[PDB]
Ligand binder design. Structure first.
Ligand SMILES: N#Cc1cnc(NC(=O)Nc2cc(-c3ccccc3)[nH]n2)cn1
Length: 267
């Protein structure tokens, strides 16, 4: 209808490659994922998605052997850059980001999708610091026609992967995403990852199973969120807390965080 409304200028590299695109007419900002030929499954999964804590998918264009993915631009950047090394962030900010992460994950599991690579690099923030789950490149459908299929593929990032992925041939999808959410929560509250990987050979992982919480990173975390981490970072995935029970947790429901300060005057 309106000329040049389909034209986007690529103005900067955000993170294949991810570039910030600005509309020539409306000045609307979107993120364009350029993939030089996993991607067929990524587009298919992105077409199913519609939630306030999941990166929006606007559409895709194919120019020969190159795939263009038009995705939500999040001006707040990555959650990763809000974590101060060896410190973390204020507990009320981490609680709010954790609430929004749980809302995103509940939505994905509800439509039978597992992300499989939850980590602060894949959690983006909008202009109002709302968390958005990003990159469905490793995501897969674990429930179809109300039938659950057990996973067996090695996917993810070692410091965030659940121990069953390294020890068992097959495993349920949902406890794997719950575990990575617990590692994200640890990182937000301590500014450090507890272990290189969740194996008996890793001293830090053995110390946690022996409840040595007087050591780092656990010593930096208050007893209320630490009690929640004791229920998430459980080696047996069948005994691990589920998201309905995380929503009933005492720290999860603890009042800590004030709303965004809103302009006010006196007298
Ligand atoms: N896969 C994927 C993906 C990657 N990025 C997306 N959106 C986005 O806005 N990414 C982004 C934005 C920034 C950024 C960096 C510094 C300052 C402000 C924003 N980094 N990365 C959307 N989907």
């Amino acid at each position: 209808a309106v000329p040049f409304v389909e034209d986007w200028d690529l103005v900067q590299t955000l993170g294949g490659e991810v570039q910030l695109a600005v509309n020539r007419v409306t000045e609307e900002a979107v993120a364009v994922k350029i993939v030089d030929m996993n991607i067929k499954k990524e587009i298919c999964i992105n077409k199913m998605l519609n939630h306030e804590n999941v990166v929006k998918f606007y559409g895709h264009r194919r120019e020969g052997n190159i795939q263009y993915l038009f995705l939500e631009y999040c001006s707040g950047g990555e959650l990763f850059d809000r974590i101060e090394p060896d410190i973390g962030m204020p507990e009320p900010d981490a609680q709010r980001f954790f609430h929004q992460l749980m809302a995103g994950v509940v939505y994905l599991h509800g439509i039978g999708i597992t992300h499989r690579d939850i980590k602060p690099e894949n959690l983006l923030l909008d202009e109002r610091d709302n968390l958005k789950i990003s990159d469905f490149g490793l995501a897969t459908v674990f429930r179809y026609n109300n039938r659950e299929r057990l996973l067996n593929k090695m996917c993810g990032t070692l410091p965030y992967v659940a121990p069953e992925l390294l020890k068992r041939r097959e495993f349920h999808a949902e406890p794997v995403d719950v575990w990575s959410c617990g590692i994200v929560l640890t990182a937000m509250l301590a500014g450090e990852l507890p272990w290189d990987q969740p194996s008996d050979s890793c001293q830090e992982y053995s110390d946690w199973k022996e409840k040595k919480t007087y050591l780092n990173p656990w010593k930096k975390i208050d007893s209320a969120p630490l009690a929640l981490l004791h229920k998430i970072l459980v080696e047996n995935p069948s005994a691990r807390i589920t998201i309905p029970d995380i929503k009933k947790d005492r720290w999860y429901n603890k009042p800590l965080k004030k709303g965004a300060k809103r302009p006010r005057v006196t007298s």
